[PDB]
């Protein structure tokens, strides 16, 4: 670790987190689909979306885990995948000073089970996912828009939603109220093509098709 500019490696954590992944997969074969640990030492558990409550409850309550805090719950839109939405749970264990990421998937129409029974923090996070991505969480206390305007139609954070949207607001003196109209921009957003034609990272080269 004497290279000034290169991030040091911590193999002790990599061995520790890798073993715990084997521990979870052995205990929860019914739902675990993949376990991976990264170069910068973070463990990811990838599960079938029907094991959200079983897996989260086990991690929260098992004595060799105790992930009592839900740091974040979010989603990622990957259109090419037939299940375009990736649901990510990031959990913190104060007892063992460790973090684990849990990943599952869903599509536009398939619901996910709400994690509120496991973590009461998930109430608002799940509302945000619905508002921004359109994913429905079943058996939620109150699922409704949280970040978008009242009556806003669409799910902005999907990759197919235009950045500037479809409608814009202004005040009209005739009707003496704020009205919504289709969006016209005096200056169109300028799309810059920045990707270089030359590969940068060989280690991630995808196998030829």
């Amino acid at each position: 670790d004497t290279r000034p500019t290169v991030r040091p490696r911590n193999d002790v954590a990599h061995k520790q987190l890798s073993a715990f992944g084997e521990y979870v997969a052995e205990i929860l074969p019914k739902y675990v689909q993949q376990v991976q640990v990264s170069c910068f030492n973070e463990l990811e558990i990838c599960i079938h979306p029907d094991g959200v409550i079983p897996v989260l409850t086990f991690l929260r309550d098992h004595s060799n885990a105790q992930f009592k805090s839900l740091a974040d719950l979010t989603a990622v839109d990957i259109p090419t995948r037939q299940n375009r939405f990736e649901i990510v749970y990031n959990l913190l264990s104060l007892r063992f000073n460790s973090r684990i990421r849990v990943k599952t998937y869903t599509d536009e129409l398939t619901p996910i089970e709400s994690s509120v029974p496991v973590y009461k923090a998930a109430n608002w996070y799940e509302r945000e996912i619905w508002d921004m991505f359109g994913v429905f969480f079943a058996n939620h206390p109150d699922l409704r828009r949280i970040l978008t305007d009242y009556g806003f139609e669409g799910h902005p954070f999907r990759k197919d939603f235009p950045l500037s949207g479809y409608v814009e607001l202004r005040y009209d003196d005739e009707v003496k109220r704020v009205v919504a109209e289709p969006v016209e921009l005096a200056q169109e957003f300028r799309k810059f093509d920045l990707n270089s034609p030359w590969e940068a990272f060989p280690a991630y080269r995808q196998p030829p098709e």
């Binding site: 129409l109 429905f136 699922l143 009242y150 009707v175 109220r177 009205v179 109209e181």
Partner: protein, 115 residues
Amino acid sequence: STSVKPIFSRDMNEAKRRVRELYRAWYREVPNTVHLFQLDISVKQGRDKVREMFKKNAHITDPRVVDLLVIKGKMELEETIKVWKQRTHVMRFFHETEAPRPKDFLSKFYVGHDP
């Protein structure tokens, strides 16, 4: 492959029950909405608009999609009933300011290049 988790309805017959129930709630609520928000429309106009929105989607045949549309409608009901919305939000369904847009070939041709 076609086996898919449902949302609420297991068949279109069960879903169309929820659509009708939702129309009932909306139809009761327009009279109060006009009174509470102090709109300058008639109750018939509002009930016509509710019918129009329900008619737009009159082609769907997927139980899951109909469930989501019902879910989204019910959310808009909680907003309007509880006055989370405002007069500007309720009146956006009627598109009063938008001057009529041409819908014939010649009219589109005279104005611009759009289809």
